[PDB]
Design a protein around this motif. Structure first.
Motif, mmCIF file in Angstrom:
data_model
loop_
_atom_site.group_PDB
_atom_site.id
_atom_site.type_symbol
_atom_site.label_atom_id
_atom_site.label_comp_id
_atom_site.label_asym_id
_atom_site.label_seq_id
_atom_site.Cartn_x
_atom_site.Cartn_y
_atom_site.Cartn_z
ATOM 1 N N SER A 182 0.754 -1.177 0.093
ATOM 2 C CA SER A 182 0.157 -0.173 0.066
ATOM 3 C C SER A 182 0.733 1.160 0.022
ATOM 4 O O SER A 182 2.102 0.971 0.388
ATOM 5 C CB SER A 182 -0.834 -0.130 1.053
ATOM 6 O OG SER A 182 -0.310 -0.243 2.297
ATOM 7 N N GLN A 183 0.304 2.252 -0.286
ATOM 8 C CA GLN A 183 1.139 3.696 -0.306
ATOM 9 C C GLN A 183 1.642 3.736 0.992
ATOM 10 O O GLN A 183 3.034 4.399 1.150
ATOM 11 C CB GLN A 183 0.004 4.775 -0.426
ATOM 12 C CG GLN A 183 1.005 6.184 -0.604
ATOM 13 C CD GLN A 183 0.100 7.522 -0.752
ATOM 14 O OE1 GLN A 183 -0.948 7.801 -1.349
ATOM 15 N NE2 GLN A 183 0.385 8.403 0.343
ATOM 16 N N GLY A 184 1.244 3.472 2.175
ATOM 17 C CA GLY A 184 1.947 3.403 3.562
ATOM 18 C C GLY A 184 2.710 2.337 3.833
ATOM 19 O O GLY A 184 3.572 2.392 5.042
ATOM 20 N N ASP A 185 2.728 1.287 3.254
ATOM 21 C CA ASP A 185 3.648 -0.100 3.147
ATOM 22 C C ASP A 185 4.061 -0.445 1.598
ATOM 23 O O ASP A 185 3.719 -1.242 1.145
ATOM 24 C CB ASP A 185 3.227 -1.056 3.968
ATOM 25 C CG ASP A 185 4.165 -2.486 4.132
ATOM 26 O OD1 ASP A 185 5.312 -1.921 4.186
ATOM 27 O OD2 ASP A 185 3.501 -3.289 4.220
ATOM 28 N N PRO A 186 4.995 0.623 0.901
ATOM 29 C CA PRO A 186 5.231 0.554 -0.322
ATOM 30 C C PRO A 186 6.462 -0.429 -0.758
ATOM 31 O O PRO A 186 6.757 0.023 -1.991
ATOM 32 C CB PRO A 186 5.406 2.042 -0.721
ATOM 33 C CG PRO A 186 6.155 2.576 0.550
ATOM 34 C CD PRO A 186 5.696 1.793 1.784
ATOM 35 N N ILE A 187 6.922 -0.945 0.200
ATOM 36 C CA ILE A 187 8.080 -1.824 -0.365
ATOM 37 C C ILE A 187 7.652 -3.280 -0.328
ATOM 38 O O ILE A 187 7.175 -3.756 0.772
ATOM 39 C CB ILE A 187 9.361 -1.782 0.672
ATOM 40 C CG1 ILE A 187 9.737 -0.224 0.891
ATOM 41 C CG2 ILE A 187 10.564 -2.422 -0.048
ATOM 42 C CD1 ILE A 187 10.078 0.711 -0.343
ATOM 43 N N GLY A 188 8.017 -3.981 -1.078
ATOM 44 C CA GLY A 188 7.454 -5.563 -1.359
ATOM 45 C C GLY A 188 8.708 -6.524 -1.893
ATOM 46 O O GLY A 188 9.625 -5.917 -2.306
ATOM 47 N N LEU A 189 8.528 -7.712 -1.515
ATOM 48 C CA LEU A 189 9.435 -8.644 -2.033
ATOM 49 C C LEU A 189 8.759 -9.685 -3.183
ATOM 50 O O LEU A 189 7.747 -10.044 -2.884
ATOM 51 C CB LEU A 189 9.975 -9.641 -0.715
ATOM 52 C CG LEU A 189 10.607 -8.965 0.164
ATOM 53 C CD1 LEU A 189 10.987 -9.840 1.231
ATOM 54 C CD2 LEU A 189 12.003 -8.360 -0.266
ATOM 55 N N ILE A 190 9.438 -9.942 -4.056
ATOM 56 C CA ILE A 190 9.096 -10.983 -5.463
ATOM 57 C C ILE A 190 10.382 -11.853 -5.702
ATOM 58 O O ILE A 190 11.265 -11.564 -5.593
ATOM 59 C CB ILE A 190 8.497 -10.001 -6.457
ATOM 60 C CG1 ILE A 190 7.912 -10.686 -7.383
ATOM 61 C CG2 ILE A 190 9.768 -9.124 -6.952
ATOM 62 C CD1 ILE A 190 7.098 -9.960 -8.408
ATOM 63 N N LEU A 191 9.815 -13.140 -6.033
ATOM 64 C CA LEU A 191 10.598 -14.154 -6.276
ATOM 65 C C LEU A 191 10.561 -14.396 -7.876
ATOM 66 O O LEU A 191 9.758 -14.237 -8.484
ATOM 67 C CB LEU A 191 10.481 -15.573 -5.707
ATOM 68 C CG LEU A 191 10.184 -15.535 -4.120
ATOM 69 C CD1 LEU A 191 9.368 -16.579 -3.481
ATOM 70 C CD2 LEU A 191 11.788 -15.850 -3.667
ATOM 71 N N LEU A 192 11.961 -14.780 -8.306
ATOM 72 C CA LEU A 192 12.137 -15.493 -9.462
ATOM 73 C C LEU A 192 12.474 -16.868 -9.313
ATOM 74 O O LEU A 192 13.617 -17.062 -8.759
ATOM 75 C CB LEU A 192 12.999 -15.002 -10.421
ATOM 76 C CG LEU A 192 12.573 -13.452 -11.176
ATOM 77 C CD1 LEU A 192 13.963 -12.607 -11.613
ATOM 78 C CD2 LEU A 192 11.492 -13.584 -12.228
ATOM 79 N N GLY A 193 11.650 -17.721 -9.916
ATOM 80 C CA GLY A 193 11.972 -19.180 -10.070
ATOM 81 C C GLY A 193 12.043 -19.747 -11.220
ATOM 82 O O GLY A 193 11.381 -19.306 -12.160
ATOM 83 N N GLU A 194 13.295 -20.568 -11.347
ATOM 84 C CA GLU A 194 13.285 -21.717 -12.230
ATOM 85 C C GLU A 194 12.156 -22.711 -12.066
ATOM 86 O O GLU A 194 12.161 -23.425 -11.081
ATOM 87 C CB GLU A 194 14.519 -22.211 -12.341
ATOM 88 C CG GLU A 194 14.805 -23.083 -13.378
ATOM 89 C CD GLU A 194 16.266 -23.947 -13.425
ATOM 90 O OE1 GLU A 194 16.885 -23.539 -12.704
ATOM 91 O OE2 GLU A 194 16.083 -24.902 -14.345
ATOM 92 N N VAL A 195 11.182 -22.728 -13.101
ATOM 93 C CA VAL A 195 10.131 -23.718 -12.882
ATOM 94 C C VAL A 195 10.202 -24.556 -14.144
ATOM 95 O O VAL A 195 10.315 -24.160 -15.212
ATOM 96 C CB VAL A 195 8.735 -22.936 -13.284
ATOM 97 C CG1 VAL A 195 7.507 -23.858 -12.673
ATOM 98 C CG2 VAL A 195 8.736 -21.659 -12.199
#
Ligand SMILES: NC(=O)c1cccc2c(O)c(Cc3ccc(C(=O)N4CCN(c5nc6ccccc6[nH]5)CC4)cc3)oc12
Ligand SMILES: [Cl-]
Ligand SMILES: [Cl-]
Length: 240
Positions: free
Chosen positions: A141-154
């Motif tokens: 959200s605007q108030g929690d604007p940092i996130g984590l995302i993965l790249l997987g070999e699938v």
């Protein structure tokens, strides 16, 4: 005090919200900063830039840090699928509060007592080729604007290609995965190969698939062993 590089310390603080180095060991995951100016970094930043869907216009994404990751033993675990054809570097987004469990245990299939709501193809491990489709699952959200995302070999192998929701009890014989066919697809001509893995970082074109429920592709495996987590990105979401 910590002997980890500062960017890994900040990742740890974000994931755990004990000493930093003790919390690192609980992830049972080798974590390395990818250099900003490396070819690896150029390819990943290009994947982010090119596969932001036009309908996901509430935010723009900036890559803060890129981490190369190696879960303890996930190598040995991936061995049976290592030389399966059609291995693809795909996005998986999740809430930040999930990442200690995801790194320590790997991505897991939802338990039988979780709702099947949100899973067009039943309980499995879900990936996108569009960064924003996965980034939406970070619930920033605007108030929690940092996130984590993965790249997987699938390890996708022979894909069971579906256009409508269907909770398959069992893959057809000779199929290894499901691909939900979207109206919009990364341009296949722009596919590149990173460490023997296909990266569909082409800008979105019309797939020419008609009579489909999905705006964008999704990819599903029903065996945890078909996933080898390769990178973890710290994303800034710039909300509009
Ligand atoms: N995620 C993608 O990038 C992604 C990419 C492409 C397509 C899709 C697609 O349809 C989905 C479905 C989806 C996601 C999430 C949920 C959901 O509510 N939870 C699952 C994750 N939970 C959870 N808590 C955890 C705590 C510790 C450790 C692990 C944990 N795991 C919370 C509940 C339902 C359906 O996702 C897609
Ligand atoms: Cl969502
Ligand atoms: Cl299944």
């Amino acid at each position: 005090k910590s002997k980890l590089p500062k960017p890994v310390q900040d990742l740890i603080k974000m994931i755990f919200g004990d000493p930093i180095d003790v919390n690192y060991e609980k992830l049972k995951t080798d974590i390395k900063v990818v250099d900003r100016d490396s070819e690896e970094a150029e390819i990943i930043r290009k994947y982010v830039k090119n596969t932001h869907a036009t309908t996901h216009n509430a935010y723009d994404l900036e890559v803060i840090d890129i981490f190369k990751i190696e879960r303890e033993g996930e190598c040995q675990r991936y061995k049976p699928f290592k030389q399966l054809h059609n291995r693809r570097l795909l996005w998986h987004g999740s809430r930040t509060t999930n990442f200690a469990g995801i790194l320590s245990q790997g991505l897991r299939i939802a338990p039988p007592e979780a709702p099947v709501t949100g899973y067009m193809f039943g309980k499995g491990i879900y990936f996108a080729d569009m960064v924003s489709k996965s980034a939406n699952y970070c619930h920033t959200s605007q108030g929690d604007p940092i996130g984590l995302i993965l790249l997987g070999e699938v390890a996708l192998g022979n894909m069971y290609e579906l256009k409508h929701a269907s909770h398959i009890s069992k893959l057809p014989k000779g199929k290894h995965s499901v691909k939900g066919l979207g109206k919009t697809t990364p341009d296949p001509s722009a596919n590149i190969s990173l460490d023997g893995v296909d990266v569909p970082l082409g800008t979105g074109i019309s797939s020419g698939v008609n009579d489909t429920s999905l705006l964008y592709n999704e990819y599903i495996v029903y065996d945890i062993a078909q996933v080898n987590l390769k990178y973890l990105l710290k994303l800034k979401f710039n909300f509009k």
